[PDB]
Design a protein around this ligand. Structure first.
Ligand SMILES: [Ca+2]
Ligand SMILES: [Ca+2]
Lengths: 218, 212
């Protein structure tokens, strides 16, 4: 019923600017309170700001004050975070959240999915996708997503119909400066041949959508 | 400004155990504290508000205590699904500062990894690179060793490890290691081996192939 959906995230040159959007569904913004919070990949949670949609009053953390502005358009039911003059430190997953209905307290009970902001002077690159074919009980197979930037990459198996034994590994930053991961899944040996296995890789930054079929080799 | 110092940074506990997490404010916050449960790659979920008030639909094994300066989240009977990072937050007044976090991992019976190796695809060799992957599946504890041997030589600084975040149903980990080289360097060797050491193993497990 109630949810936040955030967008606008992606790659940005250091010194540059970006605008994030938090779209609210299932409740009216006027009279509610909206918070932006970020999480740098390694570390913990950091409160950025607060806006009351009705009247448009705002408050910020010292670490972003003057550089960042929160606003909201009550008529489109969407809040915004405008970020200027970005730094490597600003690389993070940004969330918006609504204050809970039940007390003066700044508890946040509904959160968006989160969107990744990456600030660096590097170029967008599409991934290559490679088979990781099985051989010989139970058998393992997968896909290799190689040489992409920036994060993130989305891997699904058979449009999402397969979730048992599916391990998508954290990406690894390589020497070259590109990212790489593997998604893998374990299946019964008897199902080989009669069950097709397709991994569904999506890297929206470069806008690559690739669905590769993994079978054994002659 | 108001500090929130969390304790500890991380902990392991058995299923059924009592877990206690501590947050500490530098100033009197009275009762204005909130706890959040964040599972990896998911948004934080509100557990507690006003120090001791359970948010609706939250399991009863979570409870909150404390006043003024010293605060406690408690899980009475730890469940596998409870793997996550937990956060205290000062909820009044602005700026609302969050604690550093507490990573909670489940302790579990020991399990030896299942090892797999994967030769590079022919279509990758085309573009002049080779990636050989070794998969260790559904094992516990986390600490494991993947050694690459290439024609029986030990390899150094040419592989990268990536670790699955602990499984939330059976509390296991998975690990991938990737050996990367120039197809010229690949095509000058015969046997590609992957050697694995774990607490569940009393003797190293080797998995290998021969180039074509
Ligand atoms: Ca409202
Ligand atoms: Ca308020």
């Amino acid at each position: 019923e109630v949810q936040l959906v955030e967008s606008g995230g992606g790659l940005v040159q250091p010194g540059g600017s970006l605008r994030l959007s938090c779209a609210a569904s299932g409740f009216t913004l006027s009279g509610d309170w909206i918070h932006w919070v970020r999480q740098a990949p390694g570390k913990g949670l950091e409160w950025l700001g607060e806006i009351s949609a009705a009247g448009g009053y705002t408050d910020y953390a010292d670490s972003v004050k003057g550089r960042f502005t929160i606003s909201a358009d009550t008529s489109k039911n969407t809040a915004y975070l405008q970020m200027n003059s970005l730094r490597a430190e600003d690389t993070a997953v940004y969330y918006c959240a609504r204050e809970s209905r039940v007390s003066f307290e700044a508890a946040m009970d509904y959160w968006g999915q989160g969107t990744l902001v990456t600030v660096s002077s590097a170029s967008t690159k599409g991934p290559s996708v490679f088979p990781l074919a099985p051989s010989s009980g139970t058998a393992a197979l997968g896909c290799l997503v190689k040489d992409y930037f920036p994060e993130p990459v989305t891997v699904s198996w058979n449009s999402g119909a397969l979730t048992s034994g599916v391990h998508t590994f954290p990406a690894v930053l390589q020497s070259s400066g590109l990212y790489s991961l593997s998604s893998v899944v374990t299946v019964p040996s008897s199902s080989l041949g009669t069950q097709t296995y397709i991994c569904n890789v999506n890297h929206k930054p470069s806008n690559t959508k690739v669905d590769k079929k993994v079978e054994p080799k002659s | 400004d108001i500090q929130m110092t969390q304790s500890p940074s991380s902990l392991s506990a058995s299923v059924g155990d009592r877990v206690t997490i501590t947050c500490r404010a530098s100033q009197d916050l009275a009762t204005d504290v909130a706890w959040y449960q964040q599972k990896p790659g998911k948004a934080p979920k509100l557990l507690i508000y006003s120090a001791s008030f359970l948010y609706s639909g939250v399991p009863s094994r979570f409870s909150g205590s404390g006043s003024g300066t010293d605060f406690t989240l408690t899980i009475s009977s730890l469940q596998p699904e409870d793997f996550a990072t937990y956060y205290c937050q000062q909820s009044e007044p602005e700026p609302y500062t969050f604690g550093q976090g507490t990573k909670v991992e489940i302790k579990r019976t020991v399990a030896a990894p299942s090892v797999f190796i994967f030769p590079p695809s022919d279509e990758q060799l085309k573009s002049g690179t080779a990636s050989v992957v070794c998969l260790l599946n559904n094992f516990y504890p986390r600490e494991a060793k993947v050694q690459w041997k290439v024609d029986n030589a030990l390899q150094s600084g040419n592989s990268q490890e990536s670790v699955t975040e602990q499984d939330s149903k059976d509390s296991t980990y998975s690990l991938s290691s990737t050996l990367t080289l120039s197809k010229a360097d690949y095509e000058k060797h015969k046997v590609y081996a992957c050697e694995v050491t774990h607490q569940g193993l009393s003797s190293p497990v080797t998995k290998s192939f021969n180039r074509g």
